[PDB]
Design a protein around this nucleic acid. Structure first.
Ligand SMILES: [Mg+2]
Ligand SMILES: [Mg+2]
Ligand SMILES: [Mg+2]
Ligand SMILES: [Mg+2]
Ligand SMILES: [Mg+2]
Ligand SMILES: [Mg+2]
Ligand SMILES: [Mg+2]
Ligand SMILES: [Mg+2]
Ligand SMILES: [Mg+2]
Ligand SMILES: [Mg+2]
Ligand SMILES: [Mg+2]
Ligand SMILES: [Mg+2]
Ligand SMILES: [Mg+2]
Ligand SMILES: [Mg+2]
Ligand SMILES: [Mg+2]
Ligand SMILES: [Mg+2]
Ligand SMILES: [Mg+2]
Ligand SMILES: [Mg+2]
Ligand SMILES: [Mg+2]
Ligand SMILES: [Mg+2]
Ligand SMILES: [Mg+2]
Ligand SMILES: [Mg+2]
Ligand SMILES: [Mg+2]
Ligand SMILES: [Mg+2]
Ligand SMILES: [Mg+2]
Ligand SMILES: [Mg+2]
Ligand SMILES: [Mg+2]
Ligand SMILES: [Mg+2]
Ligand SMILES: [Mg+2]
Ligand SMILES: [Mg+2]
Ligand SMILES: [Mg+2]
Ligand SMILES: [Mg+2]
Ligand SMILES: [Mg+2]
Ligand SMILES: [Mg+2]
Ligand SMILES: [Mg+2]
Ligand SMILES: [Mg+2]
Ligand SMILES: [Mg+2]
Ligand SMILES: [Mg+2]
Ligand SMILES: [Mg+2]
Ligand SMILES: [Mg+2]
Ligand SMILES: [Mg+2]
Ligand SMILES: [Mg+2]
Ligand SMILES: [Mg+2]
Ligand SMILES: [Mg+2]
Ligand SMILES: [Mg+2]
Ligand SMILES: [Mg+2]
Ligand SMILES: [Mg+2]
Ligand SMILES: [Mg+2]
Ligand SMILES: [Mg+2]
Ligand SMILES: [Mg+2]
Ligand SMILES: [Mg+2]
Ligand SMILES: [Mg+2]
Ligand SMILES: [Mg+2]
Ligand SMILES: [Mg+2]
Ligand SMILES: [Zn+2]
Lengths: 97, 206, 155, 97, 23, 127, 60, 83
RNA sequence: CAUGUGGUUUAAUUCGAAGCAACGCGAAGAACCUUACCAGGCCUUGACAUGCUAGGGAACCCGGGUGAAAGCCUGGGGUGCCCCGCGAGGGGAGCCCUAGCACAGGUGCUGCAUGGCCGUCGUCAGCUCGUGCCGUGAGGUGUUGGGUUAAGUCCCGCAACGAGCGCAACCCCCGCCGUUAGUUGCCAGCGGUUCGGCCGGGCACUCUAACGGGACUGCCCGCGAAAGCGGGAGGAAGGAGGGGACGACGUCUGGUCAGCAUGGCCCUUACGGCCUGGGCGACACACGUGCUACAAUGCCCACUACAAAGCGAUGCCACCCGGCAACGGGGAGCUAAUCGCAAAAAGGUGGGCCCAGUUCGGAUUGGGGUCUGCAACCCGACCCCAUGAAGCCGGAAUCGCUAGUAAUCGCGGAUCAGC
């Protein structure tokens, strides 16, 4: 199931759960999110939400950066979505000819 | 960080150990240890001589340390004064037959570790770091080397952005084992930190 | 790999029959590199297919081979938007290789207790034309035939 | 009537055996040639970097090669001028009988 | 069983000796 | 009185002593068949003389040391093959196309740092 | 805790077990070779400079 | 365990204190740092204060508790469960 | 089941690594120590540096009280010197004490201030410079192009002609051969042969470790403008002989202030220092690496063979004995081509198990012992009796490996008292 690392930061089970809830957006696609991995970090610049997920047709790797941690967490999601959606439909592009 | 140390890499091919001796299973760790404390003292004082090697020879509770160096007089002393005052200081540490010699160096500008401290020094003198390096390689080629490559790292000129400058000239084939390339490192201090001056002198291939 | 085609490894003929084919079949019985153990079993089996059927183990062996060599097979190849079962003839080389593999495999799928026995029996049934090995062979050939349709999609 | 040679360097262990071979063969009488004894190898393996990076070590060794000579029919014309013998630095010598 | 301390095969593994593997 | 070749294989070396006779063979003072008892690999340790009609015509006193029961076997195959070619230098063809006249240099490749053996890499994971 | 620590190492213990190797060169508590008195980083450094006799890079 | 050839172990600085209390007759709070120490038939009836890392734990001793060490009855880890 | 990690728990569960390139990673040895963490008792020029100044005497060795130890208290026996020394007798300086004062010290922070060292893309075939040339210019040319190669490898072509860092080569191992070398190693033939290459004797052979040789697409044929490619011979090896060492300009504001060095910021009876104890080993859970299995190509007892590289003077320990054994008591050999670790295991002959949650499997637990160690409660490895779990070949997903490889079997070493 799903894992989260808070690198050189202290975070709460609240904050963790929200992150659970956020990755859910991906569930839409109805493919398997296998051992998703979220890593949250603080740069000088603002925070960073990393993610690496294997699904039956490939992996998601992403990085969101923002002054707001939550915003960074979302940007992470925006990138992941895109990747996954392209993962699920790059197939269909070449059906004919 | 990729590159191999070009001296550890020629050891017993084009460059021979800075310590030649055997010592047994039971002694080596202490034997080597003096050689180290010996070199600290020696390099500590003999900086001002411009020393480029400290050899240590041993047989049986006695050692002949050869010092090769740029300006031998500073080591020798007042008409013979320091040299022994050091064999004195020496076997204070050594406690055995500390037989100190000297050697002169024909060209300090064809001895790498020298060229290195020189330009390392210049930067502490608040000098123009691009130009220093430019000249170091420029002097070493006028001094006849087959190749030359000086390399400075760190907050150059004082910058907040750690930068890494270098120039080189002729050939400096670090991949070649038969090529003799002298390498020497000087670590320069400034008010804002450490800059890493590396020197590469290719002298000739056997 | 990419560049030039690989070379067929040459086997050292076995020190009982001197047959190149026999060698391969032993090594297919070989597990963990313990070759002698595997060598034992092949011969063990011949002991059985000599007594249990009164003539040359060897001859029976090469028949079980010709009777498990599959001639046409399918090789999946996506055309357009569907994965097609494409019919193709098995290279001579590969008929052997396969027919070997299936022989042993079919065997280990058996209830008689020593490996020594099964390799005999399977090699017995398959030599005539019966046997779980042939069942794999027979099947592989129907798959080819049924799909005769998609055979201009051969490469 | 025999000498034993232990050092880290081989151009020297060979050169010094070679000369003692020449010392007592000239100076009388019989010398059983410099025998090349099997080298005992002290090896060192060490992780290249200072922190993490487990699978990139550097490989080091310490060859201590052995040498034995015999001066067969002794004749202390030799046994004298061996106290007058020129031995390099990186070799230690052993004599018993 | 390369891990059952109580056999010949086992004391070889665990690099020991006992009743089931004497010297 | 005698014929010799030196046989090698992996870390195994074979000293072969041929002396024409009833064809009988010995390994380290021990009977051939007694030494390789139950190793089918054996009968081609004596193989190269069969490439030259020589089974019973020569005997074999044989020393062997190092390696394993089989590379040893292999080196013997080289060593006896070696000796028949000194005994009879017109034996080049009819031993060399059979390849007996060579010594496969195929030895254990080194265990490397970062791997598990010579080549078996360690198992990793993207996710 | 550094020089305070390298010092506690130098001195003789209140019991015999507490003998622990430090590097003589940098003070490192871990990966310290008996044969040299050095930890593996230091070990590597001098050997590279050449200040380690017989010690060369092994290639095989 | 600890070898039988050697002697069943007490810290000496505790053993004496045990027995200094035998002379006058028990019973004192013996604050201790000695989990290392076996419980001894001479310790029965006493209540030794065993140090677990934070606290000197009041520990009563009886007949059934002789072979064990002093640290067993001042456990060290606090764990009320998970969640 | 072992180990790392996420997490939660906690007095504390020290800290860093973070997709590939963090996760049996720094840790090539956490009971104490280590050890940076917590509780508690302490220390204030201080565990260590260089000093300046007053009181002792220097310098050292030994116990006494309290105390968990640390510490707080402490009873003792003499400073050489050069001095006025016949003596009372004072100075002095290596080295300790006590009090001050400088200062020490900090694994406290910033790898987004840094040197160094490493990972990585990548052993990938690349990255550039000089001058000329083209372009107002960023920049192009060269480095593209035809062919070839493992390759910016070579050929040919060309506004280019050269050159540099890389590729290659020179270094190491294995493969064949010769030279030198003959004990502690080797033993073909003679003699003994105490039945052990044990002795005579020899270096043949085996080996040992040093020095050269050898392979160069050289030869042949064919294809080729050429470089080269296909193929045959000779050879131990043939087209790069198999492996290693070596990693371009740079990239990832990659990793490390906790190896070290280091600018700056920060602590100063404390963010330093010492010690006892606890913690780093926590356990509703999740992940990574792995060990052993689920068995008859298998398991068990017996008997029988064949390695290699290493290590070994508070060390390896033959062999003798007590012991079911771990082990213990004796005790020979060796600074080790001698003496020892030592048995290699798979394997081989034989015998039992007869398809069973078992003669599989070896977790968990009870109980009894061994060793290290000041001490194995937390928390060591090992032996023996008993216990004899999950597990019947593993979903989605997914790792390795192209030959002496994968698979499978054992052996050594580092660190280390033990583990
Ligand atoms: Mg990232
Ligand atoms: Mg899109
Ligand atoms: Mg099948
Ligand atoms: Mg690893
Ligand atoms: Mg069992
Ligand atoms: Mg197994
Ligand atoms: Mg060899
Ligand atoms: Mg047989
Ligand atoms: Mg192997
Ligand atoms: Mg420090
Ligand atoms: Mg220890
Ligand atoms: Mg240590
Ligand atoms: Mg935690
Ligand atoms: Mg930190
Ligand atoms: Mg990794
Ligand atoms: Mg450990
Ligand atoms: Mg601790
Ligand atoms: Mg502590
Ligand atoms: Mg950085
Ligand atoms: Mg960091
Ligand atoms: Mg850096
Ligand atoms: Mg230009
Ligand atoms: Mg234009
Ligand atoms: Mg112009
Ligand atoms: Mg340009
Ligand atoms: Mg380019
Ligand atoms: Mg260009
Ligand atoms: Mg081109
Ligand atoms: Mg290449
Ligand atoms: Mg080129
Ligand atoms: Mg061109
Ligand atoms: Mg010779
Ligand atoms: Mg070719
Ligand atoms: Mg190269
Ligand atoms: Mg960063
Ligand atoms: Mg630091
Ligand atoms: Mg700092
Ligand atoms: Mg300032
Ligand atoms: Mg402590
Ligand atoms: Mg603890
Ligand atoms: Mg840990
Ligand atoms: Mg494991
Ligand atoms: Mg059961
Ligand atoms: Mg059972
Ligand atoms: Mg414990
Ligand atoms: Mg079950
Ligand atoms: Mg079953
Ligand atoms: Mg499976
Ligand atoms: Mg299996
Ligand atoms: Mg699947
Ligand atoms: Mg490959
Ligand atoms: Mg092992
Ligand atoms: Mg060991
Ligand atoms: Mg150990
Ligand atoms: Zn160090």
């Amino acid at each position: 199931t799903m894992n989260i690392t808070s690198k050189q930061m202290e975070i709460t089970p609240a904050i963790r759960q929200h992150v659970a809830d956020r990755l859910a957006k991906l569930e839409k696609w109805q493919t398997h999110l296998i051992n998703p991995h979220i890593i949250l970090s603080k740069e000088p610049q603002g925070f960073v939400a990393d993610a690496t997920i294997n699904t039956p047709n490939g992996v998601l790797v992403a990085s969101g950066k923002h002054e707001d941690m939550y915003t960074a967490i979302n940007e992470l999601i925006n990138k992941l979505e895109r990747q996954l959606n392209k993962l699920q439909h790059k197939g269909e592009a070449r059906r004919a000819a | 960080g990729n590159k191999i140390h070009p001296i550890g890499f020629r050891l017993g091919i084009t460059r021979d150990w800075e310590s030649r001796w055997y010592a047994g299973k039971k002694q080596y760790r202490h034997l080597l240890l003096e050689d180290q404390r010996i070199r600290g003292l020696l390099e500590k004082e003999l900086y001002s001589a411009g020393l480029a090697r400290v050899d240590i020879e041993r047989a049986a509770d006695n050692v002949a340390v050869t010092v090769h160096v740029a300006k031998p007089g500073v080591v020798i002393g007042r008409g013979g004064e320091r040299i022994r005052v050091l064999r004195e200081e020496l076997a204070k540490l050594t406690g055995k037959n500390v037989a100190l010699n000297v050697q002169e160096v024909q060209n300090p500008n064809l001895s790498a570790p020298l060229v290195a401290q020189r330009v390392a020094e210049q930067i502490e003198r608040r000098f123009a770091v691009r130009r220093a390096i430019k000249q170091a390689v420029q002097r070493v080629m006028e001094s006849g080397a087959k190749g030359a490559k000086v390399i400075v790292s760190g907050r150059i000129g004082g910058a907040e952005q750690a930068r890494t400058e270098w120039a080189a000239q002729g050939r400096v084939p670090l991949h070649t084992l038969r090529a003799n390339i002298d390498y020497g490192f000087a670590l320069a201090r400034t008010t804002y930190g450490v800059l890493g001056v590396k020197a590469y002198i290719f002298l000739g291939e056997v | 790999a990419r560049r030039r085609r690989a070379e067929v490894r040459q086997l050292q003929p076995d020190l009982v029959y001197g047959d190149v084919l026999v060698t391969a079949f032993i090594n297919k019985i070989m597990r963990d590199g313990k070759k002698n153990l595997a060598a034992r079993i092949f011969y063990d089996a011949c002991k059985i297919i000599q007594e249990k059927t009164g003539q040359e183990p060897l001859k029976v062996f090469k028949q079980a081979v010709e009777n498990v060599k599959p001639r046409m097979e399918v090789r999946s190849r996506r055309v357009g938007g569907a994965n097609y079962q494409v019919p193709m003839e098995v290279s001579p080389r590969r008929q052997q290789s396969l027919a070997l593999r299936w022989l042993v495999q079919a065997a280990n799928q058996r209830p008689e207790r020593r490996a020594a026995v099964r390799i005999a029996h399977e090699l017995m049934d398959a030599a005539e034309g019966k046997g779980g090995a042939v069942k794999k062979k027979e099947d592989v050939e129907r798959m080819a035939e049924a799909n005769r349709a998609y055979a201009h999609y051969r490469w | 009537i025999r000498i034993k040679l232990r050092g880290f360097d081989h151009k020297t262990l060979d050169a010094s055996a070679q000369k003692i071979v020449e010392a007592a063969r000239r100076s009388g009488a019989q010398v059983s040639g410099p025998i090349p004894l099997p080298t005992r190898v002290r090896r060192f393996t060490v992780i290249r970097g200072p922190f993490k990076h487990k699978d990139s070590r550097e490989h080091f060794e310490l060859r201590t090669h052995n040498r034995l000579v015999d001066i067969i029919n002794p004749n202390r014309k030799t046994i004298e001028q061996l106290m007058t013998l020129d031995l390099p630095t990186g070799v230690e010598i052993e004599i018993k009988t | 069983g390369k891990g059952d301390r109580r056999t010949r095969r086992g004391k070889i593994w665990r690099g020991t000796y006992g009743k089931y593997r004497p010297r | 009185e005698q014929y010799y070749g030196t046989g090698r294989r992996k870390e195994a070396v074979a000293r072969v002593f041929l002396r024409p006779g009833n064809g009988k063979v010995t390994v380290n003072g021990q009977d051939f068949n007694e030494y390789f008892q139950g190793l089918v690999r054996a009968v081609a340790a004596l193989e190269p003389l069969r490439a030259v009609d020589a089974l019973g015509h020569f005997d074999a006193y044989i020393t062997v040391r190092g390696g394993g029961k089989s590379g040893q076997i292999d080196a013997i195959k080289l060593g006896i093959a070696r000796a028949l070619v000194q005994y009879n230098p017109d034996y080049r063809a009819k031993l060399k196309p059979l390849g007996f006249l060579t010594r496969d240099a195929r030895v254990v490749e080194r265990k490397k740092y970062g791997k598990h053996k010579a080549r078996r890499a360690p198992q990793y994971s993207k996710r | 805790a550094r020089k305070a620590l390298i010092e506690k190492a130098k001195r003789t213990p209140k019991f015999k077990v507490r003998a622990y190797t430090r590097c003589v060169r940098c003070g490192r508590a871990r990966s310290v070779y008996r044969f040299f008195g050095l930890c593996r980083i230091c070990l590597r450094e001098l050997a590279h400079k050449g200040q380690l006799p017989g010690v060369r890079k092994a290639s095989w | 365990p600890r070898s039988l050839k050697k002697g069943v172990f007490v810290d000496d600085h505790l053993l004496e204190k045990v027995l200094e209390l035998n002379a006058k007759g028990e019973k004192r709070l013996i604050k201790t740092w000695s989990r290392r120490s076996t419980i001894v038939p001479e310790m029965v009836g006493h209540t030794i204060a065993v140090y677990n890392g934070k606290q000197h734990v009041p520990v009563y001793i009886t007949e059934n508790m002789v072979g064990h060490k002093l640290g067993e009855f001042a456990p060290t880890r606090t764990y009320r469960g998970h969640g």
